[PDB]
């Protein structure tokens, strides 16, 4: 480890749903 | 006996709601046959009050 | 961040945390000088 | 003319569904595709303006926001046949609940969502020309209702200032209970609501269940019935703004007439012709019977007994076919009774209102059809007993710090419990002192 | 005060709250004035429809 | 609000296999993984336990770990085994040998990095992470040692989330292994520090439930694992369906635990009734509440009449009135007032959910926090002290490398847990 | 009347494709340069003349050149749908790219191609009778855009002199980045751009991504969306030259009104009704709402917060059905707000323009259809924060000469880094001095 914050690698995030959502039709 | 299962909101406030009027539908249903409706209004484009006479 | 998905939350102009920098709804504004007062007194002939 | 509705948390949104169902059915707002295909009133009138704004193409949209930290209930409103009404920005939902912790709602999670709510309320308040108040629905027993309700009323009170704020609040019942930490949340909520509210309406679920068991004939009531009763009360109070009448009453008149001192703003509410269809066809319902009915404790929607206190002011709203002479005869008969007592410093204890629009009947509803109704809001010293019982339950739990570690972990000092408990104790002393006669020896 | 009439000048600078009869330059006063003139026209129309049936002739 | 599952050891893998069958049935997912349901209410919360693969498919968010592949080959050979993602199966090359120290220190540290990499990879993909769910037995070897190792690592990496464990615990009479007291004591010592909430089941209680209530002539492990899957799927029901009074795992934890060490709970499920008998039962809320408090339906060997309830929670599934629930819980609190701790004014939380489990018109699951669990800990401490005073089998653990002071520390910490339960049991207002 | 467009590099050519698609669709020229043969309105209006010239057979050809050093993008224009619109001499392409090196574009490779560009611009300028400015589109982050854009602006500024030069420039976002050497190229570009440009408009990709996520409902935006928004803004700015209106604004009036001191010519841009079709049908969009909208930071296409600075001048362009009285009431209401501040030496902060032609709708577009829109360009001291972060990134990299050997090998002295960084330090000090409240009046 290069004197950093431990030899652990944090995986990324896939999706980020927001607060307000649309009311139009949604399909399966 | 348990084929039909509603939730309480749909049973009390919106009982006549068919499954075709909710946001989630299958991807093989026709959309042209459904009448258009995307807002709430007093009149249905009714001629008694909208027309301005002259 | 709070809204979610945005790169950064946009700044807000309407409100603020600091009570001495927020924008009140009821702006207490000035009346025009014309619509006040009495005006000229004008007499007819009896 | 205009009023803005703010719905917070679970009780406030569920009561909001019933309220907007009722106001839509009373005004005649329907699906645009669904033509009436039947006879209607057909009269173009401005009454909707209190609750709706027009886009100019003639669509109606309502003056409301729905606020919640858990998605389920708001996602449930986004999926029905009522999605077509609200503007999608109005339906705001967070990711995770405040888990019955006031500290979590106020400090950790509501602090992220609060700025969106104030921006939406400003966008609504900019589209008004005679705003005369906010109506707020929430329960003080839960975490998000207490924490976000307090934070939002504090911000509204700094930004909007003098404008009036009327709250409809569901308080924890005195022996029926749903969660263990209810006393802590209710005390900490009540501390904020004391400073930042103009009129507070008091509700107890046990009273509305007792009223639905005794007067209506329902053995197994559920929340939809209570919310429909609340919607009828709100419709009665706001009817004075929307329809013609003999004696109108603006929302500022409630605040001027019901509140004698700035801290004495907690009021009781009751409704008279709560009656079933089978009883309704056996009896006439004249003004004097319903006026006598509103003072019986079987008619009240809060579990308190007013015979153990003194009235300070009463505001009686009559709607439907009533004539002022009958109201005067009824009020004189009430004034004669010996079991109804007013503090001697309040000689003119009554304000009357008379409106011509009778209460609406909802197709799936349980109330009967009646030509007239009366609704009452009154200020009484009996309310001091509810706070005394909450404080005793708080003292029992707080003597051993039974659950404090959650609140201390979510960011709050232990000192804040003692401050709030002393402030509610001072409110109890205010109600003891105000009700003491200023008798002078001579 | 540079004005001949001091009371009017003093009253002019006093802030005001009434946004009714068209006096302000803000949007609220303009919208309200439009509402008032529209209401007057509508009321005259209804009254003429219900009493004066010989106006148009 | 999605849960991540971890299945460890033989007991954990078998209960997990039955659990994923029950959950897949409730959401109408075919054994090929294709959604074939008939209402949007089933689909609208499928994300909570399943991830979506391309073109309709769903994959279950679970990690399977075991030290010998025999169990893994058995679950993969099962009727729903194909649904599991192949890269999610982790196995070693030598058994746990029923020894906690080898399973925790020697093969544990060898495999733990690959399981933590997969668990972190799965958690960080979520938009908002709710707690983890773990199934394992405390009496075994790889279940206890590697389960508690993984629990400690996840508590280091995600300290702000909730940590939930489901654990099977040894009967006092039916031992399956001679060295159960050491593995159980060390595991309970690790859990009481790391866990936020832990649920316990006695195989003896499930045997008595099957024989007395269900009158099964020849019960099998599939029935016990079905009862466990029923309670496990009931606890999460309010997370994934609408209802008149929503509830959540964090809301349950905040209302159930008065003090951080008091987080061990008993479980029960009510509409249990044997086949054949013309009596139906469960057709109104009084019937469910009366059966709910019947000790025949409680999943621990300790009986409530020897202790007192600090708190309790009931989650109801079905279309029902709130008055029957509220008035029943008030009547039960008033009539049996001596068994409820008096310095709390109302001990029961209620919750109501609209969607019942398939094939039942209504159901309720009961969670209870009772001090009678102290008798079980006293029993484990007695058997541990009898074996430790005589060095009965310690050379295996010492040969793996453990210092005896870890055993004395774990015994002292468990004894202090028993003391804390006893002091809060006998507290008074004065 | 006439304006000449110069497109440089990849971003500038791709934004040019969207711009010419939009200008064609607004006038009605088919993609092959021929007017609709079947349409007979008869009033063959001259409005195209600002952007097109006629041969005599009635084909249209546009007043633009496309300049690039790599062939791929120009060959895409040559083989795409608009192949026949452009004159083949206008599409100029070199052999090899500037490889993110400003030195490679300016010293080594652009010096061979630059003389063809000046000959084409001369051939365009000879076919004009009222040329009133150049519009330039480029990015300062890449090598050929920086080096050849600077060299070409210097040569145009010496040869043509007083004629105005307006640049639309995409600056490096504060945390979004595409290449490592962006700070060096942006500093070296801005050094040349300071002396040889009359107005510079600043854009950040991070802002247009935020605007497309929050207001429009697009989950996965791509460069075509950003380029269509930029094209709409350019069409709004140039609409004042092409159609009838109540208050016209010539391109020299923008330059006269927006720049107070000769170095203070960097401006922010915003657009009001960026809205989705589902929200647009739920709300009316009157003048006062869009006027309040243009000042919210959620509407800007550059990532800066104006509350940390002061506005000096605003130019508001309204297009569509708007009436001057509503514009006057709106501007007076904006001026009343307390969180919007102007420097005290600029009392009359606003310039207004009102044009009747409404914005065009593009068949594959994502904006809704609206009857009116407003676009704003404003000068504010907040821009000083944008330069400080680029200068900080330059200082971090330059402390160790992290990549300088490429620039030194391709022909540039090491001294040029320090000179340019000192010039940007002086620009920062100019924005500090102009914004200081003078206390000499009191
Ligand atoms: N009248 C009425 N009371 C309700 C309703 N829903 C909940 N309550 C009562 O309000 C209290 C619970 O408050 P909640 O609204 O659930 O709390 P919350 O606002 O959801 O806060 P969180 O749990 O953190 O999300 C209990 O006393 C319930 O009996 C309702 O729909 N109508
Ligand atoms: N808005 C927008 N930005 C773009 C586009 N294409 C590239 N950019 C941005 O511009 C910068 C890259 O500049 P380029 O145009 O690729 O540089 P160049 O002109 O090709 O210079 P060379 O690489 O030497 O050929 C980065 O910040 C990109 O994000 C585009 O189509 N639209
Ligand atoms: N309920 C249940 N208990 C089990 C199951 N398999 C094993 N057990 C119990 O768990 C204990 C044995 O632990 P085990 O899983 O073999 O430990 P391991 O060797 O470390 O995997 C005994 O009490 C068994 O009765 C199962 O499928 N269901
Ligand atoms: Mg809630
Ligand atoms: Mg390039």
3-state per-residue secondary structure call for chain G? CEEEEEEEHHHHHHHHHHHHHHHHHHHCCCCCCECCCCCCCCCCCHHHHHCEEECCCCEEEECEEEEECCHHHHHHHHHCCCCCCCCHHHEEECCCCCCCCHHHHHHHHHHHHHHHHHHHHHHHHCCCCCEEEEEEEEECCCHHHHHHHHHHHHHHHHHHCCCCEEEEEECCCCCCCCCCCHHHHHHHHHHHHHHCCCEEEEECHHHHHHHHHHCCCCCCCCHHHHHHHHHHHHHHHHHHHHCCEEECCCHHHHHHHHCCCCCCCEEEEEECCCCCHHHHCCCCCCHHHHHHHHCCHHHECCCCCHHHCCEEEEEEEEEECCCHHHHHHHHHHHHHCCCCCECCCCCCCEEEEEECCCCCCCCCCCCCCCCEEEEEEEEEHHHHHHHHHHHHHHHHHHCCCCCHHHHHHCCCCCHHHHHHHHHHHHHHHHHHHHCCCCCCCC
The 3-state secondary structure of chain F reads CEEEEEEEHHHHHHHHHHHHHHHHHHCCECCCCEECCCCHHHHCCHHHCEEECCCCEEEECEEEEECCCHHHHHHHCCCCHHHCCHHHEEECCCCCCCCHHHHHHHHHHHHHHHHHHHHHHHHCCCCCEEEEEEEEECCCCHHHHHHHHHHHHHHHHCCCCCEEEEEEECCCCCCCCCCHHHHHHHHHHHHHHHCCEEEEEEHHHHHHHHHHHHCCCCCCHHHHHHHHHHHHHHHCHHHHCCCCECCCHHHHHHHHCCCCCCCEEEEEECCCCCCCCCCCCCCCHHHHHHHHCCHHHECCCCCHHHCCEEEEEEEEECCCCHHHHHHHHHHHHHHCHHHECCCCCCCEEEEEECCCCCCCCCEEEEEEEECCHHHHHHHHHHHHHHHHHCCCCHHHHHHHCCCHHHHHHHHHHHHHHHHHHHHHHCCCCC
Q: Is D93 on the interface with F (CB under 8 A)?
A: no
Neighbouring C-beta atoms of residue G203, cutoff 10 Å:
24
Instruction: Using CA coordinates, name the residue in chain A closest to B20.
Output: A25
Residue D440 Cα to ligand 5 middle (Å): 96
Q: Who lines ligand 2 at CB under 6 A?
A: G 9-11, 14-15, 69-70, 97-100, 139, 141-145, 170, 178, 205, 223, 226-227
Burial G231-252 (b: 16+ CB within 10 A, else e): bbbbbbbbbbbbeebeeebebe
- What is the rounded CA–CA span in Å between residue D128 and residue G411? 65
Contacts of E32 in chain D (CB under 8 A): 129-130
Q: How many CA atoms, within 13 angstroms, populate the side-chain half-sphere of residue G418?
A: 5
The best mutation among G99, G142, G227 to test binding of ligand 2, ranked by most ligand atoms within 8 Å of the C-beta, falls on: G142
Ligand 1 centroid distance, CA of D9 (Å): 8
Q: Is residue E36 helix, strand or coil?
A: helix
Distance between CA atoms of residues D185 and D182, nearest Å: 5
Q: Is A22 near chain G, with CB under 8 Å?
A: yes
The residue whose CA has the least distance to atom 26 of ligand 1 is D178
Tokens for F295? 């000790």
Beta-ladder partners of G354: G247, G318
φ/ψ (deg, to 5) at G360: -80, 155
First to last CA, chain E: 59
CB atoms within 10 A of CB D196: 17
- Interchain CB contact of F38 with A (< 8 Å): no
Q: Do chains B and E touch (3 or more CB pairs under 8 A)?
A: no
Ligand 1 atom at shortest distance from the alpha carbon of D104: 24
Whether the CB-CB separation of F349 and F313 falls below 8 Å is answered with yes
Q: How far apart are CA D393 and CA D388, in angstroms?
A: 9
Method of determination is cryo-EM
CA distance to partner chain F, nearest, from residue B33 (Å): 21
Burial B15-50 (b: 16+ CB within 10 A, else e): eebeeebbbebeeeeeeeeeeeebbbbbbeeeeeee
G281 in reach of chain B (CB within 8 A): yes
> What pairs with residue G159 in β-bridges?
none
Distance CA F179, CA F170 (A): 11
Ligand nearest to the CA of D99: 1
For chain C positions 1-46, those within 8 Å of chain E (CB to CB) are 26-33, 35-37
What would the two tokens of residue G114 be?
């630059």
Among candidates D78, D84, D113 on the partner chain, residue whose Cβ is nearest the Cβ of A21: D78
Q: Which of G70, G154, G206, G253 is catalytic?
A: G253
What SS3 class is residue C41? coil
**Mutating which of C4, C12, C13 best tests the G interface, going by the most G Cβ atoms within 10 A?**
C13
Q: How far apart are CA D69 and CA D72, in angstroms?
A: 9
How far does residue G60's CA lie from ligand 1's centre (Å)?
69
Chain G contact for D129, CB < 8 A? no
CA distance F125 to F121: 7
Q: Probe ligand 2: pick from G72, G139, G225, G301, max atoms within 8 Å of CB?
A: G139
The DSSP line for D218-269 is -SS--HHHHHHHHHHHHHHHHHHHHS-EEE---HHHHHHHH-SSTT--EEEE
Contact G229, G272 (CB under 8 A): no
Q: Which residues of F81-102 are buried (b: 16+ CB within 10 A; e: fewer)?
A: bebbbeebbbebeebbbbbbbb
Cα B50 to ligand 1 centre (Å): 44
Residues of chain E positioned with their CB less than 8 A from the CB of D130? 32
How many angstroms separate the CA atoms of E27 and G275, rounded? Answer: 23
Name the active-site residue from D70, D154, D206, D253: D253
| Burial classification of residue D142, based on how many CB atoms lie within 10 Å of its CB (0-12 exposed, 13-18 middle, 19 or more buried) | buried
Spatial CA neighbour of F298 closest among F274, F325, F269, F332 = F269
The residue whose C-alpha atom lies closest to atom 29 belonging to ligand 1 is D178
* The total number of residues written for chain B in this structure: 54
Going through chain B in order, the beta strands assigned E by DSSP cover: 24-25, 40-41
* Integer Rg of chain E from CA: 19
Gap between the Cα atoms of G212 and G221, Å rounded: 7
F303: which 2 tokens? 């009986």
Ligand 2, atom 29, lies closest to the CA of G178
Note whether G189 and G102 are within 8 A (CB): yes
Pairing of strands G52-54, G2-8: unpaired
CB E46 within 8 A of CB E40: no
φ and ψ at residue F139, rounded to 5 degrees? -80, -15
What is the distance between the alpha carbons of residues D264 and D199, in angstroms, rounded to a whole number?
9
The token pair at D338 is 């010996």
Q: What is the resolution of this structure in A?
A: 3.2
Identify whether the C-beta of residue G188 lies closer than 8 Å to the C-beta of residue G155. Answer: no
- Residue D274, token pair as written in the block: 């709560």
CA-to-CA distance for F196 and F414, rounded, in angstroms?
17
Q: How big is chain G by its Cα radius of gyration, in Å?
A: 22
Which residues, including other chains, have CB under 8 Å from residue G233's CB and lie 6 or more apart?
G269, G271, G301, G375
For residue F251, report the distance from its CA to the centre of ligand 4, in Å: 9
């Amino acid at each position: 480890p290069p004197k950093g914050a431990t030899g652990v690698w944090k995986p990324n995030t896939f999706e980020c749903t927001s607060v307000v959502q649309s009311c139009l039709r949604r399909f399966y | 006996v348990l084929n039909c299962r509603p939730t309480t909101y749909r049973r009390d406030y919106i009982p006549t709601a068919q499954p075709n009027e909710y946001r989630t539908l299958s991807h093989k249903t026709n959309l042209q046959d459904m009448p258009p409706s995307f807002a709430y209004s007093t009149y249905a484009l009714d001629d008694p009050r909208r027309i301005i006479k002259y | 961040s709070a809204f979610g998905g945005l790169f950064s939350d946009p700044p807000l102009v309407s409100t603020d945390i600091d009570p001495k920098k927020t924008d009140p709804y009821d702006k207490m504004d000035t009346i025009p000088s014309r619509y006040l007062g009495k005006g000229m007194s004008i007499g007819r002939c009896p | 003319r205009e009023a803005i509705c703010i719905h917070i948390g679970q009780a406030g949104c569920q009561v909001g569904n019933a309220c907007w169902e009722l106001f839509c059915l009373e005004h005649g707002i329907q699906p645009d595709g669904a033509m009436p295909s039947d006879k209607t009133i057909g009269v173009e009138d401005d009454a909707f303006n209190t609750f709706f704004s027009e886009t100019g193409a003639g669509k109606h949209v309502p003056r409301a926001v729905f606020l919640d930290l858990e998605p389920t209930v708001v996602d449930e409103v986004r999926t029905g046949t009522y999605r077509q009404l609200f503007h999608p920005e109005q339906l705001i939902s967070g990711k995770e609940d405040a888990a019955n912790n006031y500290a979590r709602g106020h400090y950790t999670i509501g602090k992220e969502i609060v700025d969106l709510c104030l921006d939406r309320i400003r966008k609504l308040a900019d589209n008004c020309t005679g705003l005369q108040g906010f109506l707020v629905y929430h329960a003080v027993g839960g975490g998000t209702g207490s924490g976000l309700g307090a934070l939002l009323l504090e911000r509204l009170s700094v930004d909007y200032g003098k404008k009036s704020k009327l709250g409809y609040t569901v308080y924890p019942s005195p022996q029926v209970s749903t969660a263990v930490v209810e006393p802590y949340n209710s005390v900490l909520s009540t501390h904020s609501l004391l400073e930042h509210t103009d009129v507070a309406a008091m509700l107890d679920n046990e009273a509305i269940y007792d009223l639905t068991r005794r007067n209506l004939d329902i053995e197994r009531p559920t929340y939809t019935n209570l919310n429909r009763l609340i919607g009828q009360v709100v419709s009665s109070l706001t009817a004075s703004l929307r329809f013609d009448g003999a004696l109108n009453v603006d929302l500022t008149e409630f605040q001027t007439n019901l509140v004698p001192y700035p801290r004495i703003h907690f009021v009781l509410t009751s409704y008279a012709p709560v009656i079933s269809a089978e009883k309704a066809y056996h009896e006439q319902l004249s003004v004097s019977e319903i006026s006598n009915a509103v003072f019986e404790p079987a008619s009240m929607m809060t579990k308190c007994d007013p015979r153990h206190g003194k009235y300070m002011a009463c505001c009686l709203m009559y709607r439907g076919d009533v004539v002022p002479k009958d109201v005067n005869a009824a009020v004189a008969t009430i004034k004669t009774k010996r079991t109804i007592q007013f503090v001697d410093w309040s000689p003119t204890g009554f304000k009357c209102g008379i409106n011509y629009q009778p209460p609406t009947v909802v197709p799936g509803g349980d109330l009967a059809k009646v030509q007239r109704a009366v609704c009452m809001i009154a200020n009484s010293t009996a309310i001091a007993e509810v706070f005394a019982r909450i404080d005793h339950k708080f003292d029992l739990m707080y003597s051993k710090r039974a659950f404090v570690h959650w609140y201390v972990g979510e960011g709050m000092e232990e000192g804040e419990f003692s401050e709030a408990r002393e402030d509610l104790a001072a409110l109890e002393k205010d109600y003891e002192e105000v009700g003491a006669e200023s008798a002078d020896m001579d | 005060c540079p004005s001949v009439t001091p009371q009017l000048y003093e009253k002019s600078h006093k802030p005001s709250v009434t946004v009714g009869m068209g006096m302000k330059g803000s949007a609220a006063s303009t919208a309200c004035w439009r509402d008032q003139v529209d209401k007057e026209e509508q009321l005259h129309a209804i009254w003429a429809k219900r009493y004066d049936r010989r106006s148009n002739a | 609000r999605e849960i991540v599952c971890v299945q460890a050891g033989q007991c954990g893998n078998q209960i997990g296999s039955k659990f994923w069958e029950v959950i897949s049935d409730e959401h109408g997912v075919d054994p090929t993984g294709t959604y074939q349901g008939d209402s949007d209410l089933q689909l609208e919360r499928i994300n909570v336990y399943f991830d979506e693969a391309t073109g309709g498919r769903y994959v279950p968010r679970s990690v399977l770990i075991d030290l010998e592949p025999g169990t893994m080959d058995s679950v993969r050979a099962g009727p729903y085994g194909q649904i599991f993602r192949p890269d999610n199966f982790i196995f070693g090359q030598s058994g746990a040998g029923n020894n906690w120290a080898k399973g925790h220190y020697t093969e544990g540290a060898e495999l733990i990095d690959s399981v933590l990499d997969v668990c972190c990879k799965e958690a960080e993909s979520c938009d908002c992470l709710q707690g983890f769910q773990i199934c394992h037995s405390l009496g075994g070897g790889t279940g206890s040692g590697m389960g508690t190792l993984l629990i400690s690592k996840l508590r280091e990496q995600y300290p702000d989330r909730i940590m939930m464990t489901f654990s099977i615990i040894p009967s006092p009479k039916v031992s399956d292994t001679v060295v159960e007291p050491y593995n159980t004591t060390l595991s309970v010592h690790q859990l009481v520090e790391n866990s936020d909430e832990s649920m316990c089941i006695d195989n003896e209680a499930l045997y008595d439930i099957c024989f007395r209530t269900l009158k099964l002539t020849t019960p099998t492990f599939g029935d016990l694992n079905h009862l466990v899957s029923a309670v496990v799927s009931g606890v999460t029901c309010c997370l994934r369906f609408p209802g008149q009074l929503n509830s959540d795992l964090r809301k349950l934890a905040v209302n159930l635990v008065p003090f951080p060490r008091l987080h061990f709970f008993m479980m029960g499920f009510a509409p249990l009734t044997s086949r054949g008998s013309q009596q139906y039962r469960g057709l109104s809320v009084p019937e469910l509440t009366q059966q709910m408090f019947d000790a025949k339906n409680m999943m621990q060997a300790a009986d409530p009449r020897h202790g007192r309830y600090l708190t309790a929670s009931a989650l109801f599934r079905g279309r029902m009135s709130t008055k029957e629930v509220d008035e029943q819980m008030l009547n039960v609190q008033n009539k049996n007032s001596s068994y409820f701790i008096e310095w709390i004014p109302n001990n029961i939380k209620s919750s109501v959910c609209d969607i019942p489990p398939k094939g039942l018109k209504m159901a309720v699951t009961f969670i209870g926090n009772n001090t009678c669990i102290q008798e079980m800990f006293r029993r484990v401490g007695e058997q541990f002290t009898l074996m430790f005073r005589r060095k009965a089998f310690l050379h295996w653990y010492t040969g793996e490398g453990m210092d005896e002071m870890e055993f004395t520390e774990a015994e002292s910490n468990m004894n202090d847990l028993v003391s804390e339960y006893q002091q809060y049991q006998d507290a008074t207002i004065e």
